[PDB]
Scaffold this active site. Structure first.
Site, short mmCIF file in Angstrom:
data_model
loop_
_atom_site.label_atom_id
_atom_site.label_comp_id
_atom_site.label_asym_id
_atom_site.label_seq_id
_atom_site.Cartn_x
_atom_site.Cartn_y
_atom_site.Cartn_z
N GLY A 34 25.93 -10.09 -1.49
CA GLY A 34 26.74 -9.66 -2.45
C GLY A 34 27.09 -10.46 -3.64
CB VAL A 36 31.03 -14.89 -5.27
CG1 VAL A 36 32.47 -15.70 -4.67
CG2 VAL A 36 30.32 -14.84 -3.80
CG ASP A 140 20.33 -19.81 0.62
OD1 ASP A 140 19.17 -20.39 0.32
OD2 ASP A 140 20.78 -18.80 0.19
#
Length: 283
Positions: A34, A36, A140
């Protein structure tokens, strides 16, 4: 769910200028992706991150990780929203942005000193150590996902891909290519991959260069290891010029950690405890 605040969607929509997706520097609320967004809730600034059933279980997955993983070097989850047909996660806001942007001096910020860089590297390692100790793999690790609070304390963030360990394989290869270990690029899930990615980060800290630059030779920062090993170049050639307090000894000590982290074979890499110790001894 360790006492997180439950937000209604409209509250978060209100405080984000109706989820204004324009970058902040152009008048919007987007600070990254998504997606931020920056928001102002109750005298506090916050970070708001905005298949239907499968997105829901990833949403539940991250809350699970954030409930269990609380540490000074990890971004803290403040709350969530799941009523406006659009899922949100709300985090502690880190005023000094990402390590990536501070290394590039984005928006005219002062270059980070060597002393600060070592502190951030140690902080990041401490954060990763907590995750591995508690049997999580980040998946990540990169400088954009190392955020910096008011005192430039390193905060590991973006846990949307994080997995619990007990090496397994996945069909859905995820992560950032320029930071990924070879086994990770082949679908293996192992904490050894985090270490490799952390080695790239250490290189960025030393050089101030991004992990990838399509107009650079080499395009991938990780390839400078081979140029140095085949003594064409020295680490000295690559040291960030935007410092005046970088002594050869500690820089070489950090590079040595980075080089070990970047071993192509996962089993020859140090674990995070060794990385932690080595960064301590450099200091």
């Amino acid at each position: 769910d360790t006492r997180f605040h439950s937000f209604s969607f409209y509250e978060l929509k209100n405080v984000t200028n109706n989820f204004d997706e324009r970058p902040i520097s152009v008048g919007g609320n987007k600070m990254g992706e998504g997606v931020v967004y920056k928001g102002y809730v109750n005298n506090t600034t916050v970070a708001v991150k905005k298949t239907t059933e499968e997105l829901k279980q990833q949403f539940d997955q991250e809350i699970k990780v954030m409930a269990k993983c609380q540490h000074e070097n990890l971004v803290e989850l403040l709350g969530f929203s799941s009523d406006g047909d659009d899922l949100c996660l709300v985090y502690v806001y880190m005023p000094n942005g990402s390590l990536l942007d501070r290394l590039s001096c984005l928006d005219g910020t002062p270059p980070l000193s060597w002393h600060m860089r070592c502190k951030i590297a140690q902080g990041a390692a401490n954060g990763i150590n907590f995750l591995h100790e508690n049997h999580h793999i980040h998946r990540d690790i990169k400088s954009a996902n190392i955020l910096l609070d008011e005192a430039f304390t390193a905060k590991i963030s973006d846990f949307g891909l994080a997995r619990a360990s007990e090496t397994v394989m996945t069909s859905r290869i995820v992560g950032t290519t320029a930071y990924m270990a070879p086994e990770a690029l082949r679908g293996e899930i192992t904490p050894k991959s985090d270490i490799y990615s952390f080695g790239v980060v250490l290189l960025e800290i030393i050089t101030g260069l991004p992990a990838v630059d399509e107009h650079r030779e080499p395009q991938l920062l990780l390839d400078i290891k081979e140029e140095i090993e085949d003594e064409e170049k020295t680490i000295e050639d690559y040291i960030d010029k935007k410092m005046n307090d970088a002594d050869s000894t500690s820089v070489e000590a950090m590079y040595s950690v980075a080089s070990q982290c970047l071993h192509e074979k996962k089993n020859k890499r140090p674990d995070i405890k060794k990385v932690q110790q080595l960064l301590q001894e450099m200091t």
